[PDB]
Paper text:
Here, the high-affinity copper(II)-binding tripeptide GHK was fused to the N-terminus of a GFP variant and an MBP-FG peptide fusion. The GHK tag promoted crystallization, with various residues (His, Asp, His/Pro) from symmetry molecules completing the copper(II) square-pyramidal coordination sphere. Rapid structure determination by copper SAD phasing could be achieved, even at a very low Bijvoet ratio or after significant radiation damage. We further show that an N-terminally fused GHK peptide can be utilized in standard crystallographic methods to enhance the crystallization of proteins and to provide reliable phasing sites for structure solution with minimal effort.
GFP proteins have commonly been crystallized in MPD with Ca2+ ions, and a second crystal form of GHK-GFP could be grown at pH 5.5 under these conditions. High-resolution data (1 × 360°) were collected at a wavelength of 1.34 Å from thin plate-like crystals to 1.3 Å resolution. The GHK tag in crystal form II shows completion of the coordination of copper(II) ions in the equatorial plane by the side chain of Asp76 from a symmetry-related molecule, since at this pH the other histidine side chains will be protonated. The first is a weakly ordered site with an occupancy of 0.29 coordinated by chain A residues His25 and Glu132. The second was a highly ordered site occupancy of 1.0 coordinated by chain C residues His25 and Glu132 but with additional coordination by His77 from a symmetry-related molecule. The sites were verified using the CheckMyMetal (CMM) server.
Author numbering: 0 to 64, 66 to 228
Write the structure that this text describes.
């Protein structure tokens, strides 16, 4: 008698994000809480580094730190893979290649724990330059709008995504982060495998002036598009 799929997303849903990271041997954890509203495609989240100082720039973790909160227009609802997997959820895996620098590999479980949508991530960063833009903390505390191109992966009963994130560098240069993404449902329940489309993803980062801990406040608007 449980709610599944779209019915889990009719209103505002609480979100928990938990990440463990190891980048060039630097261990860290992140905890985020807030809420998602798939009716307007809006996310509001506050993140803290629970292990002290974050050894990489916050912007490099944004894509890793819940695409089930994307607004799918009424005419695109049958192409929403992300909600179709809920509540059992999906595994989201990425390779993120920073141009002229190291690579993040991520594995996340996105699923309901009671009434909360939880994103549980393990992140391994390898082959970073200790004096590069990432471990050297030379990325601006800001974020650009990006389109995430989604395609069905019928062999894996899931989806793939490819996109390049543009991180503004303090000297005015750009640090590219090439993303390779695959999502696989948890369990044997069938999912909706979409026609090619994209998620228009708009991100605003801010700081709480009263917060002493290493932290990131995030707002996102995400809208699916590209199907008629
Ligand atoms: Ca700048
Ligand atoms: Cu049920
Ligand atoms: Cu180091």
């Amino acid at each position: 008698g449980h709610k599944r799929g779209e019915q889990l997303f009719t209103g505002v849903v609480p979100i928990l994000v938990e990440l463990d990271g190891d980048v060039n041997g630097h261990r860290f954890s992140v905890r985020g809480e807030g809420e998602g509203d798939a009716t307007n495609g809006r996310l509001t989240l506050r993140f803290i580094c629970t292990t002290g100082r974050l050894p990489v720039p916050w912007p490099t973790l944004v894509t890793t730190l819940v695409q089930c909160f994307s607004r799918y227009p009424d005419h695109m609802r049958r192409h929403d893979f992300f909600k179709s997997a809920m509540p059992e959820g999906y595994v989201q895996e990425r390779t993120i290649s920073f141009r002229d620098d190291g690579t993040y590999r991520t594995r996340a479980v996105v699923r309901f724990e009671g009434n909360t949508l939880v994103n549980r991530i393990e992140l391994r960063g390898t082959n970073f330059r200790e004096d590069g833009n990432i471990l050297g903390h030379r990325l601006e505390y800001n974020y650009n709008s990006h389109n995430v191109y989604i395609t069905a992966d019928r062999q894996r009963n899931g989806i793939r995504a490819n996109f390049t994130i543009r991180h503004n560098v303090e000297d005015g240069s750009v640090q590219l982060a090439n993303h390779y993404q695959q999502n696989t449902p948890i369990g044997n329940g069938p999912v909706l495998l979409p026609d090619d489309h994209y998620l228009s993803t708009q991100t605003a980062l801010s700081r709480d002036p009263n917060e002493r801990r290493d932290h990131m406040v995030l707002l996102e608007f995400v809208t699916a598009a590209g199907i008629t």
